[PDB]
Write a protein that binds this ligand. Structure first.
Ligand code: CL
Ligand code: CL
Lengths: 293, 293
DNA sequence: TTGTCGGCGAATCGCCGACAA
DNA sequence: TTGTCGGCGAATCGCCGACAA
């Protein structure tokens, strides 16, 4: 289910539609793969590459549960939801799970309060179609919504620890969906060979106008690097200036406008906005909005 | 400890020494990275690349325990040991671990048989220096060597299942070492971008005579692709012929001698020997020996 | 509102010879 | 030689209100 995939990725995540023109930004692709590790031949590669979004394949690791997507590019010429950060008691083998009162009313199905105690056995599917059975009971003094039977098994099988978060989604159907967003945490190739591979594949696809492929790792990608081409153009046509107040979907002030990496990426709009927050320091024009909406 | 690293990799594994000339075989490097997944721009890349072995870095995944090495190449112009495949009872929460009688005598320290029952608390370090305490008891009827206290914890923490194997090494020192060899089982880059990255990095290093780097995954590499250059030359000078009997460090018969992939790797000695076993079908001259020693 | 706790009953865990392959 | 089993004692597991933040 695609709604579950975006929930585990992040609330502000929504990939461009297949068949639409997108702006491929290689600086951001490298930033993603460089976050997995810690010079190279210089390629004549443009800082932006308009591409047709040929295909998207949402995927999830079975054992680890991390979500990722495979995108195919070709260079050119809603539902009720809630998330809770798991506490120590939630993950402890001692007790069960404390359901936020707002979540049980706005997300979980309504219990029969005429029962004593009100209870139901919920059944939720994860990203791989596996069913999970939870007993949802309303007890305690003061009274509360708890998940008892089936919760600790869910904790051990998915190896959940405190600080992690559990997700629940209820669509129009009675079926429930459950997800996991783990707290922040080179096996096949070294980083320079990964770095070189990204450039050469993009270069070959750019000069030949042939389609290539990449992996999107949402929870390991600081800034999206496949954005709608229209959103990219409207950002370029925008004329930011020093001292302007901006906002992010947190507020700050633009302190400068210059290139982020003028050595190998001259004239690039990537992270070209020097900013200072009010309470990371280099952002792109398309991820900010003038701070007076 | 380097002895533990090679134990977890495999008995027939021993990398060339640092500072020696090695034969880099890109066909085998691709075979390794293609085993992690399931067309590309053609590169003028030779089937063998003599390189100086600049550095080796043995490493091990902390959580998963898989071993890998980072090698740095530059193109040019002993101890008592035993291994047991873990049974169901070994991994079951029910009992402990059955130590093979030959292992306790030839590897583990000698128990004081004057005790009743003979026992000692062993302390072994894993690949990351963590200590593991096991009670080694000699009991049962018929009598046997068992590991009781500390074994089931070792099973749960390392997530061991039946079919996996445990290793133990005893050097000249009293300190013991323990290892794990798990049964046979794309996150950051797609396979074509991995494929392209291997070629381009090797190509750039070959034409510029600059040093590059790669990852060796022993338990995911079917045939070694960084071998001593002398061993490669002596294989080329060898004149195999059809019908010759060969042996592998299993015996068979050579049925043909031709190129393995004449499309993109013409005139390559890689897997250039068609063989038929007596009881996989394409091997290289340097991994076989005439079957009459 | 909700995280943590103690309390017991339920249950898995773990060490021990008893047995065949 | 050694894998699996039953047997109990040891122990963690799990559901329940009681309590403050
Ligand atoms: Cl899916
Ligand atoms: Cl080491």
């Amino acid at each position: 289910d695609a709604e579950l995939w975006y929930a585990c990725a992040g609330p502000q995540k929504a990939l461009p539609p297949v068949g639409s023109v997108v702006a491929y930004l290689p600086q951001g692709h490298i930033e993603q793969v460089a976050s997995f590790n810690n010079q190279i031949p210089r390629y004549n590669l443009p800082a932006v590459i308009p591409c047709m979004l040929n295909d998207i394949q949402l995927s999830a690791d079975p054992d680890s549960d991390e979500v990722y997507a495979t995108l195919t590019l070709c260079p050119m010429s809603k539902s009720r939801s809630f998330t809770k950060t798991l506490t120590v008691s939630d993950t402890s083998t001692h007790g069960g799970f404390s359901v936020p009162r707002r979540a049980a009313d706005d997300c979980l199905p309504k219990l029969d309060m005429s029962l004593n105690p009100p209870n139901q056995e919920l059944v939720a599917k994860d990203l791989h179609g596996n069913e999970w059975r939870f007993r949802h009971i309303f007890r305690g003094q003061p009274k509360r919504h708890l998940l008892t039977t089936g919760w600790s098994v869910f904790v051990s099988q998915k190896r959940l620890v405190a600080g992690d978060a559990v997700l629940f989604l209820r669509g129009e159907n009675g079926q429930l969906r459950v997800g996991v967003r783990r707290a922040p945490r080179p096996k096949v190739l070294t980083s320079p060979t990964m770095h070189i591979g990204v450039l050469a594949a993009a270069a070959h696809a750019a000069t030949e106008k042939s389609r290539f492929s990449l992996i999107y790792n949402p929870r390991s990608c600081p800034s999206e690097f496949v954005i709608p081409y229209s959103k990219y153009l409207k950002a370029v046509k925008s004329n930011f200036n020093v001292g302007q107040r901006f906002k992010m979907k947190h507020t700050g002030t633009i302190t400068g406008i210059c290139d982020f990496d003028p050595a190998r990426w001259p004239g690039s709009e990537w992270r070209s906005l020097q900013v200072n927050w009010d309470e990371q320091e280099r952002v792109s024009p398309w991820e900010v909005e003038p701070g007076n909406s």
